[PDB]
Design an enzyme around this catalytic site. Structure first.
Site, PDB file in Angstrom:
ATOM      1  N   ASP A   1       0.913  -1.141  -0.112  1.00  0.00           N
ATOM      2  CA  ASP A   1       0.006   0.122   0.148  1.00  0.00           C
ATOM      3  C   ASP A   1       0.864   1.328   0.010  1.00  0.00           C
ATOM      4  O   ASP A   1       1.400   1.731   1.098  1.00  0.00           O
ATOM      5  CB  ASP A   1      -0.905   0.189   1.070  1.00  0.00           C
TER       6      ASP A   1
ATOM      7  N   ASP B   1      -1.079   5.607  -5.627  1.00  0.00           N
ATOM      8  CA  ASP B   1      -1.419   4.850  -4.536  1.00  0.00           C
ATOM      9  C   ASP B   1      -1.993   3.466  -5.103  1.00  0.00           C
ATOM     10  O   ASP B   1      -2.987   2.879  -5.486  1.00  0.00           O
ATOM     11  CB  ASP B   1      -2.900   5.423  -3.976  1.00  0.00           C
TER      12      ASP B   1
HETATM   13  C1  LIG Z   1      -8.367   1.879   4.448  1.00  0.00           C
HETATM   14  C2  LIG Z   1      -7.069   1.436   5.019  1.00  0.00           C
HETATM   15  C3  LIG Z   1      -6.668   1.587   6.142  1.00  0.00           C
HETATM   16  C4  LIG Z   1      -6.023   3.263   6.579  1.00  0.00           C
HETATM   17  C5  LIG Z   1      -5.413   3.556   5.334  1.00  0.00           C
HETATM   18  O1  LIG Z   1      -5.760   3.528   4.046  1.00  0.00           O
HETATM   19  C6  LIG Z   1      -5.891   2.068   3.821  1.00  0.00           C
HETATM   20  C7  LIG Z   1      -6.304   1.607   2.535  1.00  0.00           C
HETATM   21  C8  LIG Z   1      -7.294   2.736   1.866  1.00  0.00           C
HETATM   22  O2  LIG Z   1      -6.677   3.467   0.590  1.00  0.00           O
HETATM   23  C9  LIG Z   1      -5.359   2.934   0.616  1.00  0.00           C
HETATM   24  N1  LIG Z   1      -4.603   3.405  -0.068  1.00  0.00           N
HETATM   25  N2  LIG Z   1      -5.066   1.932   1.827  1.00  0.00           N
HETATM   26  C10 LIG Z   1      -6.821   0.284   2.185  1.00  0.00           C
HETATM   27  C11 LIG Z   1      -7.118  -0.246   1.053  1.00  0.00           C
HETATM   28  C12 LIG Z   1      -7.583  -1.538   0.849  1.00  0.00           C
HETATM   29  C13 LIG Z   1      -7.484  -2.191  -0.558  1.00  0.00           C
HETATM   30  C14 LIG Z   1      -9.262  -2.529  -0.796  1.00  0.00           C
HETATM   31  C15 LIG Z   1      -9.277  -3.052  -2.102  1.00  0.00           C
HETATM   32  C16 LIG Z   1      -8.379  -3.212  -2.978  1.00  0.00           C
HETATM   33  N3  LIG Z   1      -7.126  -2.680  -2.772  1.00  0.00           N
HETATM   34  C17 LIG Z   1      -6.904  -1.957  -1.511  1.00  0.00           C
HETATM   35  F1  LIG Z   1      -5.470  -1.647  -1.175  1.00  0.00           F
HETATM   36  C18 LIG Z   1      -7.734  -2.200   2.021  1.00  0.00           C
HETATM   37  C19 LIG Z   1      -7.676  -1.715   3.185  1.00  0.00           C
HETATM   38  C20 LIG Z   1      -7.263  -0.394   3.429  1.00  0.00           C
HETATM   39  O3  LIG Z   1      -7.007   0.273   4.736  1.00  0.00           O
END
Ligand SMILES: C[C@]12CCCO[C@@H]1[C@]1(COC(N)=N1)c1cc(-c3cccnc3F)ccc1O2
Ligand code: NI
Length: 393
Positions: A34, A223
């Protein structure tokens, strides 16, 4: 970096993960890669969506930091206990480091059923780490404790189960087999997210003609943790209008353009040529220069196999509205080999050796484009008293 090639796996739309080990003896977990966050956090208690989790009690090298961490976000949270332990990447550099690890003990809408990952590797900077910027992110620890160069690169490659994806995370270098043609660099504007500046947007060669600050309102980031290309409201609306116009021979439901409904064609007959290419021009290393990255409908229309009609090719529209700026997610990254050159505060793009294309068009990275007296396309986020009051010793 042959041993690091092909070290990423995942299910389409559910994030790319790398195998990591935590503790002594090593406990293997699959960890979401991530670039949009900065914590290393792993499931550390039973959860319906976890087959396995970090067992701190089984690790002779685990140390409790006696500090909790709570991480809320839109429609969810993860929380748990901070500690340190020994961490390695089996298909990465031949090193072991002591990193901070957040042991996730409670979560809501964090884990994804069937994604096959048990934790998250935030590769962004300390500024956005939780609980605060004093919690050293994993990559910072890796660099400080080893001789690993301060750079990583990502090549993300796009009936009852979702499609499998693969890719490479090359830590400490650039692997020339993963790209073709020129490698073009855009500055990291500020080290928090991997923030960049978009100076121009075209849809099938036609300029959107917006004030360029609109493209970066309130930021633009690269991202790997976001599936879609996400665009600021006004930009999203202009893009949708242009894409609709190009593809107008086909009348799709409103649901499709909202990403809420699939559209299908008979197997192999998808009219790719009615959908336009999208070009994002990124600020060059040289003041008045830019380069463009161009993606195809093969990138922004995501394949989803339908049980009810398995003889059709069905697609989700993977461009969506944002209220938190542009997000160059997996949709963008799947076109390219992306170099996160932290040492030189820049992000590199080159055409990926694995990108999906046809015999007519290809994802491209092209430049330079020079603009006489280039404007400042950066947005300055209004400073809250909260943020302003923080001391930075
Ligand atoms: C929400 C957080 C926790 C807090 C920080 O952001 C996190 C996030 C949201 O955006 C990014 N960049 N990571 C994130 C992305 C995914 C995901 C879901 C689906 C596909 N790909 C992914 F990385 C899953 C969980 C997740 O956890
Ligand atoms: Ni002070």
């Amino acid at each position: 970096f042959v041993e690091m090639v092909d070290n990423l796996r995942g299910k389409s739309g559910q994030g790319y993960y790398v195998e990591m080990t935590v503790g002594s003896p090593p406990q293997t977990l699959n960890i979401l890669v991530d670039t949009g966050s900065s914590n290393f956090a792993v499931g550390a208690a039973p959860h319906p969506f976890l087959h396995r989790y970090y067992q701190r009690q089984l690790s002779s090298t685990y140390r409790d930091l006696r500090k909790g961490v709570y991480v809320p976000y839109t429609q969810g949270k993860w929380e748990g206990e901070l500690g340190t332990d020994l961490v390695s990447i089996p298909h990465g550099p031949n090193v072991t480091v002591r990193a901070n690890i957040a042991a996730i003990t409670e979560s809501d809408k964090f884990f994804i059923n069937g994604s096959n990952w048990e934790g998250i590797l935030g590769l962004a900077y300390a500024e956005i780490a939780r609980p605060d910027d004093s919690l050293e992110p994993f990559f910072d620890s890796l660099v400080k404790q080893t001789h690993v160069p301060n750079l990583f690169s990502l090549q993300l490659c796009g009936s009852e189960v979702l499609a499998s994806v693969g890719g490479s995370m090359i830590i400490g270098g650039i692997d020339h087999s993963l790209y073709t043609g020129s490698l073009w660099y855009t500055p990291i504007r500020r080290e928090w997210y991997y923030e960049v500046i978009i100076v121009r947007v075209e849809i099938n060669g036609q300029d959107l003609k917006m004030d360029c600050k609109e493209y970066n309102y309130d930021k633009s980031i690269v991202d790997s943790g976001t599936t879609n290309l996400r665009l600021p409201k006004k930009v999203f609306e202009a893009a949708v209008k242009s894409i609709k116009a190009a593809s107008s021979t086909e009348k799709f439901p409103d649901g499709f353009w909202l990403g809420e409904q699939l559209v299908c064609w008979q197997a192999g007959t998808t009219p790719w040529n009615i959908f336009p290419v999208i070009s994002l021009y990124l600020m060059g290393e040289v003041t008045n220069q830019s380069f463009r990255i161009t993606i195809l409908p093969q990138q922004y229309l995501r394949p989803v196999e339908d049980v009810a009609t398995s003889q059709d090719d069905c697609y989700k529209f993977a461009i969506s509205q944002s209220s938190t700026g542009t997000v160059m997610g997996a949709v963008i990254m799947e076109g390219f080999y992306v170099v996160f050159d932290r040492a030189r505060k820049r992000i590199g793009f080159a055409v990926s050796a694995c990108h999906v294309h046809d015999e007519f068009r290809t994802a491209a990275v092209e430049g330079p484009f020079v603009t006489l007296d280039m404007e400042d396309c950066g947005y300055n986020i209004p400073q809250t008293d909260e943020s302003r009051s923080h001391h930075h010793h």
